[PDB]
């Protein structure tokens, strides 16, 4: 169901959402067990955190000590779970055409932390939750409408025999070369060159490296653009770009706000 379709009947149900990850926090430590130590007698006791509240012992547990207000919290001996907050934007497939996309913050825990990264389109299954937020930290006073978030419980994105058999072939060079772009009429030495570029040479320690570099020139209204598109589709981790400007993607590494951005070459 749509992120835009959620309503207060959902406030404790297990829901399903689809959308785009904008960013995530670093891992946030979330206390699961407080660890208390007695100032006078150095006795220690573990207290589970209940509904986010520290159930502080008012007096020391040991009846032979039983001093009031003497227990103190030892922060770095408490036990912490992992929490992370991720901001999920409404996918443009679902938006009405005349307004901004919505977004929902989602909380994700333990080994589900870093299930996704910025730019990932995902599904999540999670309980829709809501909580109040304060008017000011020095007061208990709460605003009369709650923050909403989804508290996730599942996330999801969006052979050798044949290899050696084909490797026995005699026509393999021509077979593979024509296969990179069989929709394109014969330019076969270009196709062979680009296949050899896909394979590449080798590296060495000492630098000399396995890169192979190719250029196509000649008339503009011809198959070279389609050829670049096909090798882009074939290669595992390459990119497509053009020699100047930036449609939020540019060639060179570049300093901007302060952050270094890596360009298309990098």
């Amino acid at each position: 169901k749509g992120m835009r379709e959620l309503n207060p009947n959902d406030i404790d149900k297990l829901i399903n959402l689809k959308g785009l990850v904008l960013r995530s926090t670093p891992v946030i430590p979330d206390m699961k067990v407080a660890f208390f130590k007695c100032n006078v007698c150095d006795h220690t006791m573990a207290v589970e955190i209940d509904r986010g509240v520290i159930q502080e012992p008012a007096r020391c547990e040991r009846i032979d000590c039983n001093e009031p207000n003497s227990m103190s919290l030892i922060h770095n001996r408490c036990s912490f779970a992992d929490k992370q907050v991720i901001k999920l934007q409404e996918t443009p497939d679902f938006v009405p055409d005349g307004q901004t996309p919505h977004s929902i913050s989602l909380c994700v825990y333990d080994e589900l932390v870093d299930s996704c990264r910025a730019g990932d389109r995902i599904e999540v299954t999670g309980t829709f939750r809501s909580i109040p937020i304060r008017a000011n930290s020095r007061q208990r006073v709460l605003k009369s409408l709650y923050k909403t978030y989804v508290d996730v419980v599942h996330v999801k994105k969006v052979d050798l025999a044949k290899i050696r058999e084909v490797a026995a072939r005699e026509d393999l060079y021509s077979l593979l070369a024509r296969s990179i772009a069989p929709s394109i009429y014969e330019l076969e030495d270009v196709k062979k060159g680009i296949l050899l570029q896909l394979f590449g040479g080798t590296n060495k320690t000492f630098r000399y490296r396995g890169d192979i570099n190719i250029l196509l020139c000649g008339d503009p209204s011809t198959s070279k653009s389609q050829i670049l598109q096909y090798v882009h589709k074939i290669t595992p981790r390459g990119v497509y770009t053009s020699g100047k400007g930036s449609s939020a993607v540019g060639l060179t590494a570049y300093i901007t706000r302060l952050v270094l951005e890596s360009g298309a070459l990098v």
Binding site: V40, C41, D64, C65
Partner: peptide
């Protein structure tokens, strides 16, 4: 004398 209490470390 001042009303006071002895608080002892040896019972730690």
């Amino acid at each position: 004398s001042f009303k006071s209490r002895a608080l002892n470390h040896v019972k730690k």
